[PDB]
Amino acid sequence: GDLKWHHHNITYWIQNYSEDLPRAVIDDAFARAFALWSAVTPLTFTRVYSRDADIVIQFGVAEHGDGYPFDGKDGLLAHAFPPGPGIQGDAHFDDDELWSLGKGVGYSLFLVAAHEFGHALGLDHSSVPEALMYPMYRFTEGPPLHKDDVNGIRHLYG
Ligand SMILES: COc1ccc(-c2ccc(S(=O)(=O)N(OC(C)C)[C@H](CCN3C(=O)c4ccccc4C3=O)C(=O)NO)cc2)cc1
Ligand SMILES: [Ca+2]
Ligand SMILES: [Ca+2]
Ligand SMILES: [Ca+2]
Ligand SMILES: [Zn+2]
Ligand SMILES: [Zn+2]
């Protein structure tokens, strides 16, 4: 089983943007979230400008083109597909949510992106509450990766 990427140079394309944050702040949150996973895998993550990228990132609302619609404010925050072709590996963010970074209102794009990118590398949800892959958003200033996350990603990639 174990869905995983079968190449090391993973490419990504930011297909569109939310207006909740500066373009540069969005780019960097995504870059940081990839940096998390880069460090503990044999994968590199390169930003490209191409619909052929492995991980296509999209901000969307309601039906946004994949038949899995978002649900307005609250409920779903984001979803991502495990490794593979096409829609597989892609990460979508619900722009009916308020996207932010600091403590306060809205959801940390960085933290939600780090969780989504976990899925996009092949991780399912964890049963360990403190875990990045635990299916509960919580804002933190602490290091996001937990042993269980690293255990999980090593299970796939070595
Ligand atoms: C500690 O830092 C964080 C940050 C964010 C999250 C997080 C992210 C999304 C959701 S959700 O509410 O949209 N929703 O999940 C609910 C239903 C539990 C979607 C559900 C959609 N979903 C899955 O159930 C799932 C299972 C396995 C792979 C990929 C997915 C996926 O995209 C989600 O999990 N997105 O990642 C919730 C929490 C968790 C921890
Ligand atoms: Ca929502
Ligand atoms: Ca893809
Ligand atoms: Ca929004
Ligand atoms: Zn989607
Ligand atoms: Zn999830």
Description:
- A 5-stranded mixed β-sheet has the order 2-1-3-5-4, covered by helices on one side.
- The chain has 158 residues and is an alpha/beta fold.
- Helix 1 packs across helix 2.
- Helix content is 25%, strand content 17%.
- Helix 1 links the parallel strand 1 (9-14) and strand 2 (44-47).
- The protein contains 3 helices and 7 strands; from the N terminus they run E-H-E-E-E-E-E-E-H-H.
- It has one domain (1-158): 3-Layer(aba) Sandwich (Collagenase (Catalytic Domain)), CATH 3.40.390.
- Residues 18, 20, 95, 97-99 line the site of one calcium ion.
- Belongs to the peptidase M10A family.
- The active site is at residue 116.
- It is found in: Secreted, Extracellular space, Extracellular matrix.
The overall number of domains is 1
> How many strands in all?
7
Please bin the fraction of helical residues. 25-40%
Helix count from the secondary structure assignment: 3
Largest sheet: 5 strands, mixed
What binds here, in terms of ligands, is: ligand E40, calcium ion, zinc ion
For the record, the CATH architecture stands as: 3-Layer(aba) Sandwich
The gyration radius over C-alpha positions equals 15 Å
Strand content: 15-25%
Q: Order of strands across the biggest sheet?
A: 2-1-3-5-4
The topology string of helices and strands comes to: EHEEEEEEHH
By secondary-structure content and strand pairing, the structural class works out as: alpha/beta
CATH topology: Collagenase (Catalytic Domain)
C-alpha geometry: globular
Instruction: State the CATH class.
Output: Alpha Beta
